Short mmCIF file of N, CA, C and O in Angstrom, two decimals:
data_model
loop_
_atom_site.label_atom_id
_atom_site.label_comp_id
_atom_site.label_asym_id
_atom_site.label_seq_id
_atom_site.Cartn_x
_atom_site.Cartn_y
_atom_site.Cartn_z
N UNK A 1 32.18 19.08 3.91
CA UNK A 1 31.73 18.75 2.34
C UNK A 1 31.54 20.00 1.68
O UNK A 1 31.88 20.46 0.70
N UNK A 2 30.64 20.85 2.19
CA UNK A 2 30.18 22.19 1.68
C UNK A 2 31.18 23.26 2.05
O UNK A 2 31.85 23.14 2.97
N UNK A 3 31.45 24.04 1.15
CA UNK A 3 32.30 24.98 1.46
C UNK A 3 31.94 25.94 2.45
O UNK A 3 32.63 27.05 2.81
N UNK A 4 30.70 25.85 3.12
CA UNK A 4 30.17 26.84 4.16
C UNK A 4 30.90 26.32 5.50
O UNK A 4 30.60 26.95 6.45
N UNK A 5 31.69 25.34 5.39
CA UNK A 5 32.37 24.95 6.66
C UNK A 5 33.86 24.98 6.50
O UNK A 5 34.65 25.18 7.52
N UNK A 6 34.34 24.70 5.26
CA UNK A 6 35.85 24.84 5.15
C UNK A 6 36.15 25.75 3.94
O UNK A 6 36.86 25.26 3.16
N UNK A 7 35.63 26.92 3.80
CA UNK A 7 35.94 27.80 2.61
C UNK A 7 37.32 27.67 2.18
O UNK A 7 37.62 27.64 1.06
N UNK A 8 38.33 27.79 3.11
CA UNK A 8 39.69 27.50 2.73
C UNK A 8 39.99 26.09 2.70
O UNK A 8 40.48 25.41 3.70
N UNK A 9 40.37 25.48 1.53
CA UNK A 9 40.62 24.19 1.48
C UNK A 9 42.19 24.09 1.09
O UNK A 9 42.82 23.30 1.86
N UNK A 10 42.62 24.70 0.09
CA UNK A 10 44.02 24.69 -0.33
C UNK A 10 44.80 25.84 0.62
O UNK A 10 45.93 25.51 0.88
N UNK A 11 44.29 26.90 0.75
CA UNK A 11 44.97 27.87 1.60
C UNK A 11 45.22 27.52 3.07
O UNK A 11 45.95 27.69 3.67
N UNK A 12 44.27 26.62 3.54
CA UNK A 12 44.39 26.14 4.97
C UNK A 12 45.78 25.70 5.23
O UNK A 12 46.27 25.97 6.24
N UNK A 13 46.41 24.94 4.27
CA UNK A 13 47.84 24.46 4.40
C UNK A 13 48.70 25.77 4.74
O UNK A 13 49.82 25.71 5.02
N UNK A 14 48.38 26.84 4.03
CA UNK A 14 49.08 28.23 4.41
C UNK A 14 48.82 28.73 5.75
O UNK A 14 49.23 30.03 6.06
N UNK A 15 48.25 28.22 6.62
CA UNK A 15 47.87 28.75 7.91
C UNK A 15 49.07 28.16 9.12
O UNK A 15 49.17 27.00 9.27
N UNK A 16 49.78 28.96 9.68
CA UNK A 16 50.85 28.57 10.51
C UNK A 16 50.25 28.81 11.95
O UNK A 16 50.41 30.08 12.71
N UNK A 17 49.57 27.95 12.56
CA UNK A 17 48.95 28.15 13.94
C UNK A 17 48.16 29.26 14.10
O UNK A 17 48.22 30.22 14.85
N UNK A 18 47.03 29.56 13.09
CA UNK A 18 46.14 30.54 13.02
C UNK A 18 46.76 31.71 12.15
O UNK A 18 46.09 32.78 11.88
N UNK A 19 48.01 31.52 11.68
CA UNK A 19 48.40 32.67 10.94
C UNK A 19 48.36 32.34 9.34
O UNK A 19 49.02 31.35 8.95
N UNK A 20 47.57 33.03 8.71
CA UNK A 20 47.40 32.50 7.19
C UNK A 20 48.25 33.38 6.23
O UNK A 20 47.98 34.62 6.09
N UNK A 21 49.33 32.97 5.88
CA UNK A 21 50.39 33.90 4.99
C UNK A 21 49.93 33.70 3.75
O UNK A 21 50.72 33.10 2.77
N UNK A 22 48.66 34.08 3.07
CA UNK A 22 48.31 34.14 1.62
C UNK A 22 49.49 34.58 0.78
O UNK A 22 49.66 33.95 -0.21
N UNK A 23 49.93 35.81 1.05
CA UNK A 23 50.98 36.30 0.31
C UNK A 23 52.19 35.60 0.06
O UNK A 23 53.21 35.82 0.86
N UNK A 24 52.35 34.53 -0.70
CA UNK A 24 53.39 33.65 -0.70
C UNK A 24 54.01 33.68 -2.19
O UNK A 24 54.85 34.36 -2.57
N UNK A 25 53.42 32.84 -3.18
CA UNK A 25 53.93 32.81 -4.53
C UNK A 25 52.75 33.03 -5.38
O UNK A 25 52.20 32.11 -6.21
N UNK A 26 52.11 34.27 -5.44
CA UNK A 26 51.03 34.48 -6.47
C UNK A 26 51.49 34.33 -7.82
O UNK A 26 50.59 34.45 -8.80
N UNK A 27 52.70 34.15 -8.11
CA UNK A 27 53.19 34.12 -9.48
C UNK A 27 52.16 33.13 -10.26
O UNK A 27 52.08 33.24 -11.53
N UNK A 28 51.44 32.16 -9.62
CA UNK A 28 50.50 31.38 -10.45
C UNK A 28 49.55 32.20 -11.13
O UNK A 28 48.88 31.91 -12.16
N UNK A 29 49.46 33.44 -10.98
CA UNK A 29 48.49 34.34 -11.64
C UNK A 29 48.66 34.06 -13.14
O UNK A 29 47.81 34.33 -13.89
N UNK A 30 50.01 33.76 -13.49
CA UNK A 30 50.07 33.39 -15.03
C UNK A 30 49.26 32.24 -15.41
O UNK A 30 49.27 32.02 -16.61
N UNK A 31 48.55 31.65 -14.72
CA UNK A 31 47.74 30.49 -15.08
C UNK A 31 46.43 30.68 -14.52
O UNK A 31 46.17 31.43 -13.51
N UNK A 32 45.34 29.85 -14.92
CA UNK A 32 43.90 29.92 -14.58
C UNK A 32 43.85 29.60 -13.29
O UNK A 32 43.44 30.29 -12.34
N UNK A 33 44.54 28.36 -12.74
CA UNK A 33 44.36 27.83 -11.52
C UNK A 33 45.03 28.87 -10.48
O UNK A 33 44.51 29.06 -9.45
N UNK A 34 46.00 29.57 -10.89
CA UNK A 34 46.66 30.50 -10.17
C UNK A 34 45.77 31.79 -9.97
O UNK A 34 45.45 32.23 -8.85
N UNK A 35 45.45 32.21 -11.13
CA UNK A 35 44.37 33.47 -11.28
C UNK A 35 43.15 33.09 -10.29
O UNK A 35 42.61 34.00 -9.64
N UNK A 36 42.79 31.90 -10.09
CA UNK A 36 41.60 31.38 -9.25
C UNK A 36 42.07 31.45 -7.89
O UNK A 36 41.74 32.14 -7.05
N UNK A 37 43.00 30.50 -7.49
CA UNK A 37 43.53 30.46 -6.03
C UNK A 37 43.82 31.94 -5.65
O UNK A 37 43.28 32.29 -4.71
N UNK A 38 44.45 32.46 -6.34
CA UNK A 38 44.77 34.14 -6.01
C UNK A 38 43.59 34.85 -5.69
O UNK A 38 43.41 35.52 -4.65
N UNK A 39 42.54 34.53 -6.39
CA UNK A 39 41.26 35.28 -6.14
C UNK A 39 40.67 34.62 -4.83
O UNK A 39 40.22 35.39 -4.01
N UNK A 40 40.99 33.52 -4.54
CA UNK A 40 40.38 33.02 -3.28
C UNK A 40 41.37 33.03 -2.23
O UNK A 40 40.98 33.08 -0.87
N UNK A 41 42.69 33.55 -2.61
CA UNK A 41 43.55 33.82 -1.60
C UNK A 41 43.22 35.07 -0.77
O UNK A 41 42.83 35.09 0.46
N UNK A 42 43.22 36.29 -1.13
CA UNK A 42 42.83 37.44 -0.55
C UNK A 42 41.59 37.22 0.11
O UNK A 42 41.32 37.79 1.16
N UNK A 43 40.72 36.20 -0.29
CA UNK A 43 39.34 36.06 0.28
C UNK A 43 39.60 35.17 1.28
O UNK A 43 39.14 35.35 2.37
N UNK A 44 40.25 33.99 1.24
CA UNK A 44 40.27 32.97 2.13
C UNK A 44 41.01 33.59 3.29
O UNK A 44 40.93 33.10 4.54
N UNK A 45 41.68 34.69 3.18
CA UNK A 45 42.49 35.28 4.34
C UNK A 45 41.38 35.96 5.29
O UNK A 45 41.35 35.87 6.36
N UNK A 46 40.51 36.81 4.61
CA UNK A 46 39.51 37.51 5.71
C UNK A 46 38.48 36.29 6.01
O UNK A 46 38.10 36.43 7.43
N UNK A 47 38.49 35.13 5.73
CA UNK A 47 37.71 34.01 6.33
C UNK A 47 38.36 33.69 7.70
O UNK A 47 37.55 33.53 8.68
N UNK A 48 39.62 33.75 7.96
CA UNK A 48 40.18 33.62 9.22
C UNK A 48 39.82 34.73 10.16
O UNK A 48 39.57 34.57 11.39
N UNK A 49 39.95 36.07 9.65
CA UNK A 49 39.86 37.15 10.42
C UNK A 49 38.39 37.17 10.98
O UNK A 49 38.12 37.81 12.10
N UNK A 50 37.43 36.46 10.47
CA UNK A 50 36.12 36.38 11.08
C UNK A 50 36.09 35.64 12.26
O UNK A 50 35.25 35.92 13.14
N UNK A 51 37.04 34.66 12.43
CA UNK A 51 36.98 34.03 13.72
C UNK A 51 37.41 34.75 14.80
O UNK A 51 37.19 34.43 15.96
N UNK A 52 38.11 35.76 14.40
CA UNK A 52 38.63 36.89 15.69
C UNK A 52 37.52 37.53 16.44
O UNK A 52 37.56 38.06 17.35
N UNK A 53 36.49 37.49 15.39
CA UNK A 53 35.21 38.50 15.92
C UNK A 53 34.50 37.69 16.85
O UNK A 53 33.66 38.05 17.89
N UNK A 54 34.58 36.33 16.87
CA UNK A 54 33.68 35.36 17.71
C UNK A 54 34.45 35.33 19.05
O UNK A 54 33.66 34.97 19.94
N UNK A 55 35.60 35.63 19.20
CA UNK A 55 36.20 35.66 20.40
C UNK A 55 37.62 36.26 20.32
O UNK A 55 38.27 35.83 19.50
#
């Protein structure tokens, strides 16, 4: 429920077995939703890199 457990909600689908390919179609930048997701993209990506430090 809280974003403190699943910060990546839409980008999650962009994860291929632990591989987050955020760089896909940022063209959405031409819109607010795109400007937003794109802002959460580069960020949602580092969210996965954090799991690599736990193990």
